[PDB]
Structures are given as structure tokens and as C-alpha cells.
Amino acid sequence: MRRYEVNIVLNPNLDQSQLALEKEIIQRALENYGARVEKVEELGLRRLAYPIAKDPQGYFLWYQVEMPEDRVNDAARELRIRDNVRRVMVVKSQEPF
């Protein structure tokens, strides 16, 4: 297994209720692909490098996970289908918590 950082940007107009749901779905998907979720951070609202879905900002979520490298891409695709997920970026962990 390898340790990765998953950066997710969500629709910025969700209320705390919808937000919590998206988080559970993300967690379940990562775990269904063999991931051990080590740390989860809610970063909040940021101005995006470029607008997505016509929105100039997004709600950021960060995850540190350990999972099979052969499943990373499949997991990322799964995450990208959700309508409220605007952007997904997976990088190899360099300085883990």
C-alpha cells in the first residue's frame, strides 16, 4: 500500500446537512476501494484558480489515506461522478502527519 493525499473541492452552496452527507459518501467510497482514512480536514471556502460549474469558489476537503496504488484511479473516478464534487486531485504524500 501507499500513502496519498486526496484534495476534494465541493459545491460551495451546500448547507451543513448536504455537506455531511457528501463527506460520508466520500469516506465510504474510499474505504470500499481499500483505503485506510488516517486524517480528514475541512479547509472551507477558497477562491479557485479558475471557475468550475460557473462558480468561482469551492468548499475544500483534504484526506490523508493509505490504500492500494492499483485502486487509486478507480476511486478517483468514483468520486468525480458525484454532482457536488467539482474537483478531485490525488498526490503522493511527501510529509505525512
From Swiss-Prot:
For whether the record's keyword set contains Ribonucleoprotein, the answer is: yes
The record's listing under SUPFAM superfamilies reads: Ribosomal protein S6
Record's keyword terms, sorted: Ribonucleoprotein, Ribosomal protein, RNA-binding, rRNA-binding
* Entry-linked InterPro entries: Ribosomal_bS6, Ribosomal_bS6_CS, Ribosomal_bS6_sf, Ribosomal_S6_plastid/chlpt, Transl_elong_EF1B/ribsomal_bS6
GO cellular component annotations of the record? cytoplasm; ribonucleoprotein complex; ribosome
Please give the PROSITE patterns that the UniProt record associates with this protein.
RIBOSOMAL_S6
- Matches recorded under Pfam families: Ribosomal_S6
User: Per its record, what are the GO molecular function terms?
Assistant: small ribosomal subunit rRNA binding; structural constituent of ribosome
Q: Which GO terms describe its biological process?
A: translation
Carries keyword Ribonucleoprotein?
A: yes
UniProt subunit comment? Part of the 30S ribosomal subunit. Forms a tight heterodimer with protein bS18.
Regarding protein family, the annotation reads: Belongs to the bacterial ribosomal protein bS6 family.
The record's function comment reads: Located on the outer edge of the platform on the body of the 30S subunit.
Protein name (database record) = Small ribosomal subunit protein bS6
* Gene of this entry: rpsF
